[PDB]
Design a binder for this molecule. Structure first.
Ligand SMILES: */O=N(/*)[O-]*
Ligand SMILES: */O=N(/*)[O-]*
Ligand SMILES: */O=N(/*)[O-]*
Ligand SMILES: [Cu+2]
Ligand SMILES: [Cu+2]
Ligand SMILES: [Cu+2]
Ligand SMILES: [Cu+2]
Ligand SMILES: [Cu+2]
Ligand SMILES: [Cu+2]
Lengths: 334, 334, 334
C-alpha cells in the first residue's frame, strides 16, 4: 500500500518512567506514527555525593522516552541536534531493518536535523541508542539510549493464547556509567569532551561500572517519585539495558508473565522470581499486585542494587491478605 | 479454608547438599508445613590456604538448608536469633508474596525469635536470603542465603506433560565472597563486624569475587564428600546463586531437562550442555546417568571453577558403555 | 548395530569462519564420521598494536574448526600432538557422554596421538575444548576450543514443526584472552610456558579480559575477510564462547529464529534483537537478509565489541527496500 495514503498520527512523548498514551489493541489500520526528539547534552548529578557528569540525552532524560507503535505501523522520527550541542549524534533502532538500524542515515552535526522512516515489522520491546562510528560505547554509556515498544495489533497474549491486558505501564531504563577515577579512587572532571575522551575510554576498558542507576540517578524512583499501584491492578514493567546484562526482581512479588528477551511472538515465562535481560536488549514483565505496602524493584546483583544505585520502589494501596502472608508471632524475646 | 483446620507436619532439616524427606506427588491435601531455623554467626575456613571469614548462616551451613513443600501448602517458619550472635537478621522468601518476601515482618535482634507464615502459591525452586535494610548485600555475600522447592501437587512433568520422577536430589548452593584485600593483594582480618563494614563495602564495590564456592568452601563437594549416583539413576540437581549469575555444567554429562530460571509451570529446556541461572535465582536440572566414573560439576567460567572454587565432583558406579564412548587407539607414540 | 558394519566417511575440515561440506537432511543411515586434528602451539598477533601471545590451537586456528555430523552418527577423532609442541593436551566434547567428554581418554604428550569415538546422541551445537587436569582455564583461554554441530537427521525445524533450511553457514568463535600486565598497564612477555604460568593464573584471577575477539584477532572478520550474503539468503550463524557469557547482536538485523543455548529439540526464540549465550555453550541464529549494505555483528557489551575486539562485519549485496526503511529528509541545517 502507498504510504502517502495511510493516516498520520502525531505522538507527544512523556518523561520516563511514564509512557505516552496508546491503545493495546489497534483501533485503526496501519499508520505512519510521527515522533520528534531533540538531543540534549547536559550536566546531570547521578548520586547522593553530588557526582556530576556530562550526559548525552534524547529529549533531556536518561533513559530517553518510551515510543509505542503497533506491528506494521511506520515509525517516522524527526531527530533534532540543536547548535547548543557540541557533538555529532545519530540513532539506531533495534526494531528496524537495514542501515545499522538507521544509524547510517541519521548522522546529525550540531545545527542539523533529519527525518527517518522505518516499518516496525516485528512485535516486542527493543532498545534504541546513539552509535556514531568510532565512539559508540562512549555515547551509549553517557546515557544516550531508550526503548520502543511494538505491540501486536491484537494486544498481548499469554502462553495459551488468551489476552493479557495491563492497567498501568512503566518504563525502567537501567544505565551503567564509567566515571573516570584517579589512582586514589576519586572521580575526575574535565573541561572539554575531547580532553575527557581518553580517560572515558580507559574507564570503560576496566569493564567495571562506577554507578548503575534507574531513571538517571541513585534514588530516582523513590520518595515522591516511587512507582505506584493498587491491589488487583495489572502492571507491565518494560526494562532496558543497552550495554550490560541485568537481572530484575520485584522484592515481595514476581513476574507472573515475563518476556525476558522482549519479543511477543514467543510465549512468556511464568512465575519468575528473577530473569536475565542481556545487555543490548529490552524485556517486559507483567504482574498483578496482591498485597499493599512498599516493594523494591532491583537488579538482583544486590551490590549493584544497594551500593551502586540499581533500585527503585513501588508504593501499593489496598487491603492486606493474611491468608497469603502473616506474622504468626511478632519478633520478641522469650 | 480456615487454616486451623488443616494438618500440621513438622520438618526436620538436613545439611546441604542433602535434602530432607518428602514425596514428589502430594500424598495429602494442603498442609501447614512447620520449619525451624537457628541463625549462627561463625568463623569458616573457605580455601586451601586457610583464609577464615566471619560467615552469617541459617542453621550453621553455607548455603542454608533446602526446604521442600507443595504448591498451596503454607510454610510456617520459626526463626531464632540466639543471644550468642551480635547482629540483627531477617528472612526474605522469593517464593512468598508481600512484605518484601517476609523481610519486613521477621527482623530479629540477638535474643529474639519470630514465626512467619506464607502460602506457597507458585511452583518452582526459589532463593531465600537475609536482607536487613541498609546492609543487604553484606549479609547475603557473608553466606546468609539458601533455597526452597515448591513442587507441583502432581510432581514434575516434561515438555510434553508426562511425569519426570527423580531417584536422588542434591542442593548446590554457590557463594560469591568478597574478602577485603590490602594494596599488595593479601586478605585483611578484622576485630569486630563494625570495624569490618567499610572495607566489606569497598571489597563488594569492586564487583570482583575473591572466592566462588559450592557448599561453603573450596573442595567441599569432593573426596569423602563427592556426590554419588549409579548408572541408570535419575538425579535432580537444584542450584542457587543469590547475588551473581552462574553457568552450571556437568562435565561428561548434560542437563536432560533444565528449568534454568527454576519455575515448573514452564516446559523445561532439553539436552542442555550449560545453562544460565541469573543472580537472585534458583534453577534445577534433571539427568539420567549413562556412564560410570568421575564427573566434575562446575560453573563454566572455568577460571571461577578451577581457580576460585566453583567445582564439585560426582562418583558414579556401574558398567561402562563402549557404544556411547570408547578409546579406539589409546595415547601412544608411533 | 555392530559399528564395524556401518559406512565410514572421512571429513576434510576448513578454517573458520567457513564450515566443511555437509547435508542438512541426512542422505544416508548412521555413519562413523572420521575427523583428524593436529594440535599447534604458535605465536599469534591479536590486536592492531602488535600484541603477540602464545596460542594453543586445534588445527592452527582460534577457534578450532567446526565439525558437523547428524544425531546418532559416531564421531571418530584422530588427535595428533606433534613433537614440535611442548605441552600435554587433550579434548573434551560437550556433545559426548562419559569420561569428562573424552578428556580422561585423550591425554597426549608431544610426539603422541590417540583416536576417540563417541555416539552423538543429542542434536545441537556444542563446545569442544582442551582440559588438562590442573591447567584447564589456561588452555581454554589460550584459544584451545571450537565447536561441533549435531544436526537432527531431518534437518532444522521452526517453532511449529516446519522446515528451516539455510543457504549459508558461518562459525564465529569468540575468545576472551587475559594477557598479563605490569603495574603500569603494559603487557608482559615470557621466555617459557612454565615461567609464564603464575602470571597467567594471576591475570585470569582478575576475571577481566584484556581482549575479546572473533576468529582469533581484532578485525579478523572485516575488510577482505568480512562475511558475505545476498538479499533473500537464509544464513545460520553458529557462535561459541567456551569460558564467558556473550550477547550477540546483528546491527541492522535480527535473529529470526535463535537457539540461544544451542539445542535443536527445543523450539527457537523468535525475532530476537540480542540473546545470551552462557560461557561454556554454543548457540545458533538463523536470519533471512532483507536489505543490502554493511552490517556489524557484535557482542552487545559495546565496550567489549568496539574497544576490546568483539565485532565483525557482513557485506550484503542486492536491492534496497524503501518500504522497510528510508531517509525522508537527509541530515541538513535548516
Ligand atoms: O528478595 N529480594 O532481594
Ligand atoms: O567440559 N567441561 O569443562
Ligand atoms: O544497534 N547495535 O549496537
Ligand atoms: Cu550521541
Ligand atoms: Cu545496538
Ligand atoms: Cu543476616
Ligand atoms: Cu532477593
Ligand atoms: Cu591444550
Ligand atoms: Cu567444558
Amino acid at each position: 500500500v502507498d504510504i502517502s495514503t495511510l493516516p498520520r498520527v502525531k505522538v507527544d512523548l512523556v518523561k520516563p518512567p511514564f509512557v505516552h498514551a496508546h491503545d493495546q489493541v489497534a483501533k485503526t489500520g496501519p499508520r505512519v506514527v510521527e515522533f520528534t526528539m531533540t538531543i540534549e547534552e547536559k550536566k546531570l548529578v547521578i548520586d547522593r555525593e553530588g557526582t556530576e557528569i556530562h550526559a548525552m540525552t534524547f529529549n533531556g532524560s536518561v533513559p530517553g522516552p518510551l515510543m509505542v507503535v503497533h506491528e506494521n505501523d511506520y515509525v517516522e522520527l524527526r531527530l533534532i541536534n540543536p547548535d547548543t550541542n557540541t557533538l555529532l549524534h545519530n540513532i539506531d533502532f533495534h526494531a528496524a531493518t537495514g542501515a545499522l538500524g538507521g544509524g547510517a542515515l541519521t548522522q546529525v552535526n550540531p545545527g542539523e536535523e533529519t527525518t527517518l522512516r522505518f516499518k516496525a515489522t516485528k512485535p516486542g520491546v527493543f532498545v534504541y541508542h546513539c552509535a556514531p562510528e568510532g565512539m559508540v560505547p562512549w555515547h551509549v554509556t553517557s546515557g544516550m539510549n531508550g526503548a520502543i515498544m511494538v505491540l501486536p495489533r491484537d494486544g498481548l497474549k499469554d502462553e495459551k493464547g488468551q489476552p493479557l491486558t495491563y492497567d498501568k505501564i512503566y518504563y525502567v531504563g537501567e544505565q551503567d556509567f564509567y566515571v573516570p577515577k584517579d589512582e586514589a579512587g576519586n572521580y575526575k572532571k574535565y573541561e572539554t569532551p575531547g580532553e575527557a575522551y581518553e580517560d572515558a575510554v580507559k574507564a570503560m576498558r576496566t569493564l567495571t561500572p562506577t554507578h548503575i542507576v534507574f531513571n538517571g540517578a541513585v534514588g530516582a524512583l523513590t520518595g515522591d517519585h516511587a512507582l505506584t499501584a493498587a491491589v488487583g491492578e495489572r502492571v507491565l514493567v518494560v526494562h532496558s539495558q543497552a550495554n550490560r546484562d541485568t537481572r530484575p526482581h520485584l522484592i515481595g512479588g514476581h513476574g507472573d508473565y515475563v518476556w525476558a528477551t522482549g519479543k511477543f511472538r514467543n510465549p512468556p515465562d511464568l512465575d519468575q522470581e528473577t530473569w536475565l535481560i542481556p545487555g543490548g536488549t529490552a524485556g517486559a514483565a507483567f504482574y498483578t499486585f496482591r498485597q499493599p505496602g512498599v516493594y523494591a524493584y532491583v537488579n538482583h546483583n544486590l551490590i549493584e542494587a544497594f551500593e551502586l544505585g540499581a533500585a527503585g520502589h513501588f508504593k501499593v494501596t489496598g487491603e492486606w491478605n493474611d491468608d497469603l502472608m502473616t506474622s504468626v508471632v511478632k519478633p520478641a524475646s522469650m
